[PDB]
Amino acid sequence: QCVNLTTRTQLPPAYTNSFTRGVYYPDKVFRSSVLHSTQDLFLPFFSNVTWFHAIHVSGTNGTKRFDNPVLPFNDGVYFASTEKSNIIRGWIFGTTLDSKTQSLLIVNNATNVVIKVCEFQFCNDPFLGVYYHKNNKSWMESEFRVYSSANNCTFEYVSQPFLMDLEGKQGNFKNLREFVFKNIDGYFKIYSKHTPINLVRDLPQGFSALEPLVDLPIGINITRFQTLLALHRSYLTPGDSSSGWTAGAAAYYVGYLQPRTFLLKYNENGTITDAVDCALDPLSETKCTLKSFTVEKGSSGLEVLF
Ligand SMILES: C=CC1=C(C)/C(=C/c2[nH]c(/C=C3N=C(/C=C4\NC(=O)C(C)=C4C=C)C(C)=C\3CCC(=O)O)c(CCC(=O)O)c2C)NC1=O
Ligand SMILES: *[C@@H]1O[C@H](CO)[C@@H](O)[C@H](O)[C@H]1NC(C)=O
Ligand SMILES: *[C@@H]1O[C@H](CO)[C@@H](O)[C@H](O)[C@H]1NC(C)=O
Ligand SMILES: *[C@@H]1O[C@H](CO)[C@@H](O)[C@H](O)[C@H]1NC(C)=O
Numbered sequence: 169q170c171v172n173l174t175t176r177t178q179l180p181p182a183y184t185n186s187f188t189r190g191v192y193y194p195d196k197v198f199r200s201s202v203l204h205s206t207q208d209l210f211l212p213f214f215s216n217v218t219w220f221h222a223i224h225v226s227g228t229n230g231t232k233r234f235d236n237p238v239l240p241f242n243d244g245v246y247f248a249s250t251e252k253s254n255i256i257r258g259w260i261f262g263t264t265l266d267s268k269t270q271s272l273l274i275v276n277n278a279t280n281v282v283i284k285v286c287e288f289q290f291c292n293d294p295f296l297g298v299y300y301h302k303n304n305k306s307w308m309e310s311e312f313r314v315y316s317s318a319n320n321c322t323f324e325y326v327s328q329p330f331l332m333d334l335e336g337k338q339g340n341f342k343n344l345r346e347f348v349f350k351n352i353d354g355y356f357k358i359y360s361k362h363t364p365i366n367l368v369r370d371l372p373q374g375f376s377a378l379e380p381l382v383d384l385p386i387g388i389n390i391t392r393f394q395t396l397l398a399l400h401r402s403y404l405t406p407g408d409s410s411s412g413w414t415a416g417a418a419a420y421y422v423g424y425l426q427p428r429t430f431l432l433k434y435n436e437n438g439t440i441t442d443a444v445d446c447a448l449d450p451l452s453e454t455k456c457t458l459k460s461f462t463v464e465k466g467s468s469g470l471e472v473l474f
């Protein structure tokens with residue numbers, strides 16, 4: 169199954185700013201119109217998050233990137249993709265990421281979401297592949313080169329089937345897909361949010377809390393993860409299995425959760441509509457001390473009594 173891709177070019181690591189993204193609902197308490205202070209694993213506001221690309225730049229020896237490095241998991245991850253052609257397909261999570269230990273696979277293979285925990289012998293360069301057939305103008309799922317063996321499976325879920333749109337699109341990124349992953353006491357917890365966007369780079373500023381998606385009772389150690397991307401092949405990408413491919417444009421972003429005290433605002437319906445990262449700056453420390461999003465002195469004059 170495994171193919172080590174060639175023709176990637178060198179590019180320095182790149183970064184962007186997380187603004188106030190990545191807040192998620194840290195519990196399932198029923199709330200209405202209250203602020204709640206809680207210490208949990210959060211992405212600090214205005215974090216320097218790492219920016220990864222799938223891109224094939226025009227020109228002679230134009231930059232060609234298909235970024236699927238193995239990355240640390242640390243205490244949990246914020247993951248965001250900015251998409252127009254459904255290039256990010258999922259992730260693998262584990263330790264050795266080989267047959268010596270169990271790993272978690274979460275992947276959209278164009279017809280199903282697949283969630284499996286096995287002793288996987290993952291490929292060094294795992295990827296999925298789409299083929300564009302010129303004569304009927306059809307984009308079809310063609311390659312699944314993620315692992316060469318899978319043994320002793322302890323968890324398997326396969327969603328109801330679908331047919332995902334695989335067309336490489338023109339224009340700006342249109343879909344923002346955000347995830348928080350935590351691995352707590354044997355449970356792999358996923359929070360997520362999908363948002364319409366219209367941008368070519370960076371992350372949008374507007375606030376959105378990620379909602380609980382699922383808790384997987386899988387009981388495995390996780391210290392590393394690796395993103396699964398789909399490449400494209402066609403009559404325009406001549407070469408062999410390693411070289412005859414291109415990347416449809418996509419970007420994704422990785423930040424790391426750490427222990428933080430956040431003040432969360434729940435509106436009339438229990439939606440988290442704003443948050444303060446208490447340790448961000450003196451203004452945020454002031455808000456958390458006052459248990460308030462507003463710090464301005466009032467004009468009642470009643471302070472002198474109490
Ligand atoms: C990681 C890759 C990934 C892909 C390729 C993806 C595609 C994708 N997700 C959708 C909905 C959705 N997708 C999911 C969840 C998932 N769907 C998945 O493929 C995976 C792996 C998860 C989560 C682990 C959910 C719950 C919805 C409904 C969310 C909504 O519409 O608000 C839809 C149909 C509605 C739309 O266009 O917004 C697409 C095309 N989403 C992703 O997160
Ligand atoms: C891919 O490269 C790695 C490291 O260079 C090597 O160990 C592995 O055997 C290669 N696999 C294939 C299929 O070429
Ligand atoms: C983000 O972190 C990297 C790694 O240390 C650093 O090189 C880069 O300058 C940082 N960017 C900003 C804007 O602080
Ligand atoms: C995706 O995975 C499911 C579950 O393993 C499998 O049944 C299905 O055939 C796969 N899709 C394709 C296009 O191979």
Ligand SMILES: *[C@@H]1O[C@H](CO)[C@@H](O)[C@H](O)[C@H]1NC(C)=O
Pocket residue numbers: 301304306308
């Ligand atoms: C397009 O043609 C290819 C090659 O004949 C075929 O595999 C594919 O199923 C076709 N797609 C459609 C939608 O007919």
Ligand SMILES: *[C@@H]1O[C@H](CO)[C@@H](O)[C@H](O)[C@H]1NC(C)=O
Pocket residue numbers: 270320322
């Ligand atoms: C399968 O994995 C589980 C968890 O790692 C382990 O307890 C069990 O012994 C394994 N079975 C094998 C390796 O045959």
Ligand SMILES: *[C@@H]1O[C@H](CO)[C@@H](O)[C@H](O)[C@H]1NC(C)=O
Pocket residue numbers: 387388389
């Ligand atoms: C995970 O690793 C820790 C120490 O690194 C160990 O105590 C624990 O038993 C491991 N769990 C599994 C399921 O292998």
Ligand SMILES: *[C@@H]1O[C@H](CO)[C@@H](O)[C@H](O)[C@H]1NC(C)=O
Pocket residue numbers: 435436437
């Ligand atoms: C809250 O719920 C009501 C209906 O119960 C709905 O009309 C409203 O849009 C929701 N959101 C806000 C911010 O009020």
